Write a protein that binds this ligand. Sequence first.
Ligand SMILES: Cc1cc2nc3c(=O)[nH]c(=O)nc-3n(C[C@H](O)[C@H](O)[C@H](O)COP(=O)(O)O)c2cc1C
Ligand code: SF4
Ligand code: SF4
Ligand code: SF4
Ligand code: FES
Ligand code: FES
Lengths: 439, 60, 156, 227
Amino acid sequence: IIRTPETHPLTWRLRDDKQPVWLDEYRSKNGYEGARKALTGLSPDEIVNQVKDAGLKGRGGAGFSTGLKWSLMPKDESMNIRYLLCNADEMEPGTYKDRLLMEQLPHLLVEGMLISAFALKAYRGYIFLRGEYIEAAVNLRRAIAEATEAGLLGKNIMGTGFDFELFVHTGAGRYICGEETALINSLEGRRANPRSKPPFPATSGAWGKPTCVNNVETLCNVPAILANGVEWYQNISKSKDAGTKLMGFSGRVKNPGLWELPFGTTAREILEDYAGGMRDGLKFKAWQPGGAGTDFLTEAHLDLPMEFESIGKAGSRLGTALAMAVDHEINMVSLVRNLEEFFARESCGWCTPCRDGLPWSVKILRALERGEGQPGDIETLEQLCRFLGPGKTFCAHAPGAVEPLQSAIKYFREEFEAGIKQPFSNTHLINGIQPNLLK
Amino acid sequence: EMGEYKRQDLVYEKEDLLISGPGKYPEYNFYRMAGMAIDGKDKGEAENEAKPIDVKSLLP
Amino acid sequence: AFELSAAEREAIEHEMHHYEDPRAASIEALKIVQKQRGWVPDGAIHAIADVLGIPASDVEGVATFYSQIFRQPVGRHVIRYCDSVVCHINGYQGIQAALEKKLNIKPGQTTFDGRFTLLPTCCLGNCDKGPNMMIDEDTHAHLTPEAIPELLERYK
Amino acid sequence: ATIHVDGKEYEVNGADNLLEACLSLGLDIPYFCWHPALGSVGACRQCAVKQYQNAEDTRGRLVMSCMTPASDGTFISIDDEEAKQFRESVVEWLMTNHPHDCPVCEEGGNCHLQDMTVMTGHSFRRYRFTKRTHRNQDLGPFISHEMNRCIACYRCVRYYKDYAGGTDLGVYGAHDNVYFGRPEDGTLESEFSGNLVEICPTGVFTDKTHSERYNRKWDMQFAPSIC
Ligand SMILES: Cc1cc2nc3c(=O)[nH]c(=O)nc-3n(C[C@H](O)[C@H](O)[C@H](O)COP(=O)(O)O)c2cc1C
Ligand code: SF4
Ligand code: SF4
Ligand code: SF4
Ligand code: FES
Ligand code: FES
């Protein structure tokens, strides 16, 4: 792999010994130049317009436009207290990209938060980071200290009169905190229940103030845009989704890893050229494109490009674009049981369908795995997938929960029907009462 | 055979109604089904009931 | 009879400096108490509540919401093995069986000497190097059932 | 404001949500987590109706009527088949863990959950697995506590904390182990804690003074009086 600054804007600064790049080495490799240009030559509205014109989309899994999200902030000049939050939670299973970004290139994240906070007029920034990323926390705190010593953080940054303070907030281990409104609730020191929208966080977010929540990779994509120009970012790939993206393959592949690729790279190219294909003696059965909350896809879907609309038309979600391969030796009932156990135990408990319908699916899948399935169980699972969709639950955790279950029932129904081996029995016989024998 | 001399004696209190056995239903016990805790059946000991999981438990 | 130490209290106020509302330091206060004492005991809820100026019900709701804030006593070393989907594909069940054989405990339990507490945990963000587990602050990747007894002896 | 419910036109207040507007019109929408004095939060998902974009719309989308404004020219359906199915499914999900307690529960005959179970028409159980259970707390002389019957509708904590300003009640735990109560055993310190027995739609919080000499609501003789 040849990593040029124009083709790999996020990973070309990575060292060979997997060591973090500190302030002197980062600034030698054109570091904090986009920040200098943004803070000394552009209005915040101009930076927001440039980010919108670059077509930068959200890398957290939803794929929403970053410029459109930034433009929802109020034009009221009386609201001068504003917050930028970096979603470094990354608790979706199968996702390991933000760990690479913040363990080895923390100054890229710091520069991106600086540029985005100047664009959003955000006086404060918080990196909401998961507690298991200890090395990432150490590296981020050291990089923040180095940038504060060099005058890139704090009061009067670059002599421009802009004040910005960046904090690191380490999490306490819940998957629901990665959801943006639940992230805001967790940052306020509350139980991480999500919030209803409208109002959006751009109008009243963290402590009622205007707040923008962005993924680590989006904020890491910002400085390359503002240092190389909008037309460079628009010309990375000839696809509807501009720029690069960290894509990878995990599972029982020969080379599980992570590579920076343009949008439009097919899944077979990532699986064969980069991941090295499956291991010896293993036959490719299925794959998940973007984490635990995405629909399963078959081998015939490996030829379509890894874009938002291409995967979306296939019946799945691009997600984090960190695919996971499933070989023929993996029982799909056991795998979906494991997935639903994760999703049911990571429910925040706010709303009824997720909280009380995911455990029912878990118990049905446990019975199917043990061969104690009963008639009507697959119908119950299908109705649970139907009734836990978007809009029926309070947040998007339960639709993501039911995507793999419905996709596996659609593509591997023969494994689920094999678990049904006993007749349906909900009642025991009561002596003296003749039962109502329904037909 | 419930014929009586005085109509007041047709008011049967609990001592005239409670019998020594189960009657026509020899096995049913409501308190084996109810979740309300009584003597000899704590929480989680009823039919189709799991043991209570306290909120301070270490498991996720 | 819980009493916050001077270092714990000072760390809690220093965390309170970083926010516009002192309620936002509740998770960090619980983590500070947990890091000092191994877990968060019952009186720590009221101590943190009276330091932050929030009700103890709020502190207890936060503490029982988050899985990494321990409200029951744990061993001196907490093994947290990933039971998520990619490590399931990579074979975490052999690792769990090896840990159960070595420690003679079920998940969620503590060993007889109070040395190890076995806990399943969600995905550790190390799925390309699975199966993974976390001991107290260290991540161990590429786990095999044979290396579990050797690696468990590094923590006394 | 003009709304259209099941083909019938109605005039409502545009500053109201759809649940309160429809309940003011005499229509029956099941609900748990909404209260007139507490506002809407959209937790229980019981109040689902089908909203259409316009008059010539046939697909629609399920929305929570408590969280949806009763704006001008709204088009909703309560008796839509999918909305009825989802409301029955929400009742069924609440019923999976609910204890077999109605004969020995003080809320029986006065129970909102019983009424909404009947209103959705759900009477057949197909769930066959175990029911979660909870230990109870001592809450003082007035309020008896039975957390097995909780449907996690969050009404108690919203009333007690957000409305009444009390501090010793809260929600603890996580996914399906959410527990509503005090951090430890003790008397509820609020001067308005007794409204929990009417705020709670189930028999979790019950009038203990009534429970000593319990009788059902249909057996009572009532009068309008002044305290
Ligand atoms: C259940 C759930 C978990 C999520 N977890 C994360 C996460 O761990 N990291 C992340 O960046 N986004 C996560 N998201 C997506 C966020 O809601 C949000 O889209 C993102 O944090 C910021 O948006 P962006 O991609 O435009 O930057 C999660 C969403 C849901 C519903
Ligand atoms: S779907 Fe409902 S219960 Fe589940 S995590 Fe979201 S708000 Fe919480
Ligand atoms: S709370 Fe209502 S439904 Fe539940 S046991 Fe009591 S009366 Fe029955
Ligand atoms: S205790 Fe009652 S009011 Fe509180 S959440 Fe449970 S059912 Fe609702
Ligand atoms: S699935 Fe185990 S580290 Fe991600
Ligand atoms: S009453 Fe509307 S969701 Fe609860």
